Scaffold this motif. Structure first.
Motif, mmCIF file in Angstrom:
data_model
loop_
_atom_site.group_PDB
_atom_site.id
_atom_site.type_symbol
_atom_site.label_atom_id
_atom_site.label_comp_id
_atom_site.label_asym_id
_atom_site.label_seq_id
_atom_site.Cartn_x
_atom_site.Cartn_y
_atom_site.Cartn_z
ATOM 1 N N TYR A 110 0.811 -1.210 0.000
ATOM 2 C CA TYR A 110 0.000 0.000 0.000
ATOM 3 C C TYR A 110 0.849 1.268 0.000
ATOM 4 O O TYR A 110 0.341 2.353 0.269
ATOM 5 C CB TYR A 110 -0.954 0.001 1.194
ATOM 6 C CG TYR A 110 -0.292 -0.390 2.493
ATOM 7 C CD1 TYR A 110 -0.380 -1.692 2.977
ATOM 8 C CD2 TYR A 110 0.437 0.537 3.228
ATOM 9 C CE1 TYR A 110 0.228 -2.056 4.162
ATOM 10 C CE2 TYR A 110 1.047 0.184 4.410
ATOM 11 C CZ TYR A 110 0.946 -1.112 4.870
ATOM 12 O OH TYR A 110 1.551 -1.459 6.053
ATOM 13 N N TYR A 152 -8.254 7.784 8.489
ATOM 14 C CA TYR A 152 -8.041 6.395 8.095
ATOM 15 C C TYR A 152 -7.059 6.251 6.933
ATOM 16 O O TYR A 152 -6.446 5.200 6.762
ATOM 17 C CB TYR A 152 -9.375 5.733 7.746
ATOM 18 C CG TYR A 152 -10.353 5.710 8.897
ATOM 19 C CD1 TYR A 152 -10.191 4.821 9.951
ATOM 20 C CD2 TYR A 152 -11.435 6.578 8.930
ATOM 21 C CE1 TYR A 152 -11.081 4.796 11.006
ATOM 22 C CE2 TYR A 152 -12.330 6.560 9.978
ATOM 23 C CZ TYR A 152 -12.150 5.669 11.013
ATOM 24 O OH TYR A 152 -13.044 5.653 12.058
ATOM 25 N N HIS A 157 -0.221 7.005 8.846
ATOM 26 C CA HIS A 157 0.933 6.771 7.975
ATOM 27 C C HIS A 157 1.465 8.022 7.271
ATOM 28 O O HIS A 157 0.709 8.872 6.804
ATOM 29 C CB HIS A 157 0.634 5.690 6.925
ATOM 30 C CG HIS A 157 0.123 4.409 7.499
ATOM 31 N ND1 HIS A 157 -1.184 4.247 7.908
ATOM 32 C CD2 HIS A 157 0.740 3.227 7.732
ATOM 33 C CE1 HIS A 157 -1.348 3.020 8.370
ATOM 34 N NE2 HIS A 157 -0.196 2.380 8.272
ATOM 35 N N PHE A 218 -1.719 6.167 1.074
ATOM 36 C CA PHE A 218 -2.309 5.005 1.714
ATOM 37 C C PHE A 218 -3.794 5.292 1.873
ATOM 38 O O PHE A 218 -4.170 6.358 2.355
ATOM 39 C CB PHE A 218 -1.671 4.785 3.084
ATOM 40 C CG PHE A 218 -2.412 3.812 3.956
ATOM 41 C CD1 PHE A 218 -2.508 2.476 3.603
ATOM 42 C CD2 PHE A 218 -2.987 4.228 5.143
ATOM 43 C CE1 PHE A 218 -3.178 1.580 4.415
ATOM 44 C CE2 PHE A 218 -3.660 3.333 5.955
ATOM 45 C CZ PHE A 218 -3.752 2.008 5.593
ATOM 46 N N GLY A 219 -4.636 4.356 1.449
ATOM 47 C CA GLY A 219 -6.064 4.603 1.396
ATOM 48 C C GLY A 219 -6.842 3.941 2.510
ATOM 49 O O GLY A 219 -8.042 4.162 2.656
ATOM 50 N N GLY A 220 -6.156 3.133 3.305
ATOM 51 C CA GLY A 220 -6.820 2.340 4.319
ATOM 52 C C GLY A 220 -7.091 0.953 3.779
ATOM 53 O O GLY A 220 -7.412 0.794 2.600
ATOM 54 N N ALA A 222 -5.047 -1.537 3.118
ATOM 55 C CA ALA A 222 -4.086 -1.888 2.075
ATOM 56 C C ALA A 222 -4.486 -1.412 0.681
ATOM 57 O O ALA A 222 -4.136 -2.033 -0.326
ATOM 58 C CB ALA A 222 -3.818 -3.383 2.071
ATOM 59 N N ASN B 9 -2.252 -8.546 8.520
ATOM 60 C CA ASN B 9 -3.338 -7.726 9.047
ATOM 61 C C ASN B 9 -4.629 -8.507 8.943
ATOM 62 O O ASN B 9 -5.360 -8.378 7.970
ATOM 63 C CB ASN B 9 -3.465 -6.459 8.211
ATOM 64 C CG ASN B 9 -4.343 -5.402 8.857
ATOM 65 O OD1 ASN B 9 -4.680 -5.470 10.037
ATOM 66 N ND2 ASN B 9 -4.712 -4.410 8.063
ATOM 67 N N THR B 11 -8.446 -10.109 10.375
ATOM 68 C CA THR B 11 -9.666 -10.054 11.162
ATOM 69 C C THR B 11 -10.456 -11.276 10.733
ATOM 70 O O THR B 11 -10.688 -11.464 9.539
ATOM 71 C CB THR B 11 -10.482 -8.799 10.840
ATOM 72 O OG1 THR B 11 -9.599 -7.681 10.679
ATOM 73 C CG2 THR B 11 -11.479 -8.512 11.953
ATOM 74 N N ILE B 17 -6.385 -8.683 5.389
ATOM 75 C CA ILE B 17 -6.639 -7.453 4.652
ATOM 76 C C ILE B 17 -5.601 -7.123 3.579
ATOM 77 O O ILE B 17 -5.952 -6.844 2.433
ATOM 78 C CB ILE B 17 -6.772 -6.264 5.612
ATOM 79 C CG1 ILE B 17 -7.961 -6.476 6.548
ATOM 80 C CG2 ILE B 17 -6.902 -4.966 4.844
ATOM 81 C CD1 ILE B 17 -9.279 -6.618 5.829
HETATM 82 C C1 LIG Z 1 -5.519 -3.240 8.413
HETATM 83 O O1 LIG Z 1 -6.866 -3.570 8.765
HETATM 84 C C2 LIG Z 1 -7.492 -2.585 9.585
HETATM 85 C C3 LIG Z 1 -8.805 -3.105 10.157
HETATM 86 O O2 LIG Z 1 -9.393 -4.035 9.251
HETATM 87 C C4 LIG Z 1 -7.690 -1.343 8.729
HETATM 88 O O3 LIG Z 1 -8.471 -0.364 9.422
HETATM 89 C C5 LIG Z 1 -9.692 -0.125 8.701
HETATM 90 O O4 LIG Z 1 -9.499 0.774 7.615
HETATM 91 C C6 LIG Z 1 -10.686 1.026 6.872
HETATM 92 C C7 LIG Z 1 -10.344 1.914 5.684
HETATM 93 O O5 LIG Z 1 -10.475 1.171 4.470
HETATM 94 C C8 LIG Z 1 -11.722 1.692 7.770
HETATM 95 O O6 LIG Z 1 -12.942 1.887 7.056
HETATM 96 C C9 LIG Z 1 -13.544 3.117 7.483
HETATM 97 O O7 LIG Z 1 -14.223 2.971 8.724
HETATM 98 C C10 LIG Z 1 -14.766 4.202 9.194
HETATM 99 C C11 LIG Z 1 -15.364 3.978 10.572
HETATM 100 O O8 LIG Z 1 -16.361 2.956 10.480
HETATM 101 C C12 LIG Z 1 -15.833 4.695 8.230
HETATM 102 O O9 LIG Z 1 -16.286 5.979 8.654
HETATM 103 C C13 LIG Z 1 -15.284 4.815 6.819
HETATM 104 O O10 LIG Z 1 -16.361 5.054 5.908
HETATM 105 C C14 LIG Z 1 -14.532 3.556 6.412
HETATM 106 O O11 LIG Z 1 -15.457 2.493 6.184
HETATM 107 C C15 LIG Z 1 -12.006 0.823 8.983
HETATM 108 O O12 LIG Z 1 -12.845 1.549 9.881
HETATM 109 C C16 LIG Z 1 -10.703 0.461 9.678
HETATM 110 N N1 LIG Z 1 -10.947 -0.475 10.752
HETATM 111 C C17 LIG Z 1 -10.209 -0.440 11.850
HETATM 112 C C18 LIG Z 1 -10.648 -1.343 12.961
HETATM 113 O O13 LIG Z 1 -9.236 0.284 11.951
HETATM 114 C C19 LIG Z 1 -6.325 -0.763 8.399
HETATM 115 O O14 LIG Z 1 -6.472 0.282 7.440
HETATM 116 C C20 LIG Z 1 -5.408 -1.816 7.797
HETATM 117 N N2 LIG Z 1 -4.032 -1.375 7.889
HETATM 118 C C21 LIG Z 1 -3.288 -1.244 6.798
HETATM 119 C C22 LIG Z 1 -1.863 -0.841 7.022
HETATM 120 O O15 LIG Z 1 -3.742 -1.443 5.690
#
Ligand SMILES: *[C@@H]1O[C@H](CO)[C@@H](O[C@@H]2O[C@H](CO)[C@@H](O[C@@H]3O[C@H](CO)[C@@H](O)[C@H](O)[C@@H]3O)[C@H](O)[C@H]2NC(C)=O)[C@H](O)[C@H]1NC(C)=O
Lengths: 235, 30
Positions: A110, A152, A157, A218-220, A222, B9, B11, B17
């Motif tokens: 990512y 997010y 990052h 980074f978009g969240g 990965a 990562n 769940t 993920i």
């Molecule tokens: C690794 O996984 C974690 C958790 O699965 C990732 O965090 C998650 O990131 C997503 C973004 O794609 C978040 O989605 C957002 O959630 C908020 C709150 O509900 C919402 O308002 C937005 O519309 C969007 O859906 C998600 O919440 C978040 N979950 C947690 C528990 O953190 C994280 O990004 C990943 N890490 C890497 C390095 O990729």
């Protein structure tokens, strides 16, 4: 010398599928990630997905959930991006890019570090981060371009890159990881970040700075997310 | 001094993920 050679332009009727190829050379194909993005004149930079050349594991943008398949043929070292159920909205230039270096000890899938870009592939079908649309400065001035996401994505990052695009040309790697400069880029370009907003500052504005500038991050989950673009005008 | 990390990562048992990595350990001796 690194080359990413994409397959040629295609016209598809709606409902059909397109399979775009990307053959990299001049480096070790399996050492770096491969990303797929696309761009239309009437939209910004849209990240489609990543692929690990070693294993073939992928991740795709939510908006492409189940109409995109990214693969690779290992014997010919060629990446493939297939987009199904085309409509007129899929008319765009599609890009294959390199990404983060692949390490055993962490995940860099990512990292929006797109050092090298394919020449692009125009798909015609007949049958996002928030950037200011326009930013203006006169010569010599210091200018700044914002790129706003959420806590997010860019808020977490220090993984934000910036790309310069001259008209009818391929985007160019300009800034990465918020404030780091790629080789060949003058210190006139600097980057910073505050909260959920990343900024690109161009000091000593020359006329040849006039171009489109895009932020990627980074978009969240990965993924990578890109902005709609910023046209810079030099008075 | 031993430090081990799991870059994966995940769940739920049926969902990871990002990309896939083995666990790794690093030892520092001075
Ligand atoms: C690794 O996984 C974690 C958790 O699965 C990732 O965090 C998650 O990131 C997503 C973004 O794609 C978040 O989605 C957002 O959630 C908020 C709150 O509900 C919402 O308002 C937005 O519309 C969007 O859906 C998600 O919440 C978040 N979950 C947690 C528990 O953190 C994280 O990004 C990943 N890490 C890497 C390095 O990729």
């Amino acid at each position: 010398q690194v080359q990413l050679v994409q397959s040629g332009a295609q016209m598809k009727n709606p409902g059909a599928s397109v399979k775009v190829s990307c053959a990299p050379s001049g480096y070790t194909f399996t050492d770096f990630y491969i990303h797929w993005l696309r761009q239309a004149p009437g939209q910004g930079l849209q990240w489609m997905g990543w692929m690990n050349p070693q294993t073939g594991r992928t991740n795709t943008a939510r908006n492409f959930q189940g109409r995109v398949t990214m693969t690779r043929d290992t014997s010919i070292g060629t990446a493939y991006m297939e987009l199904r159920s085309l409509t007129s909205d899929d008319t765009a230039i599609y890009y294959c890019t390199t990404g983060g270096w692949i390490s055993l000890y962490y995940d860099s899938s990512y990292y929006p570090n797109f050092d090298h870009w394919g020449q692009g592939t125009l798909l015609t079908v007949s049958g996002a981060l928030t950037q200011p649309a326009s930013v203006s400065g006169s010569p010599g001035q210091s200018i700044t371009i914002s790129c706003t996401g959420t806590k997010y994505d860019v808020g977490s990052h220090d993984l934000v890159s910036w790309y310069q695009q001259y008209p009818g040309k391929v985007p160019k790697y300009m800034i990465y990881e918020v404030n780091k400069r790629p080789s060949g880029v003058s210190n006139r370009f600097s980057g910073s970040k505050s909260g959920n907003t990343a900024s690109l500052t161009i000091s000593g504005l020359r006329a040849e700075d006039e171009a489109d500038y895009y932020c990627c991050s980074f978009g969240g989950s990965a993924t990578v997310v890109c902005g709609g673009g910023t046209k810079v005008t030099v008075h | 001094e031993i430090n081990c990390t799991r870059p994966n990562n995940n769940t739920r048992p049926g969902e990871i993920i990002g990309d896939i990595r083995q666990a790794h350990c690093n030892i520092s001796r001075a």
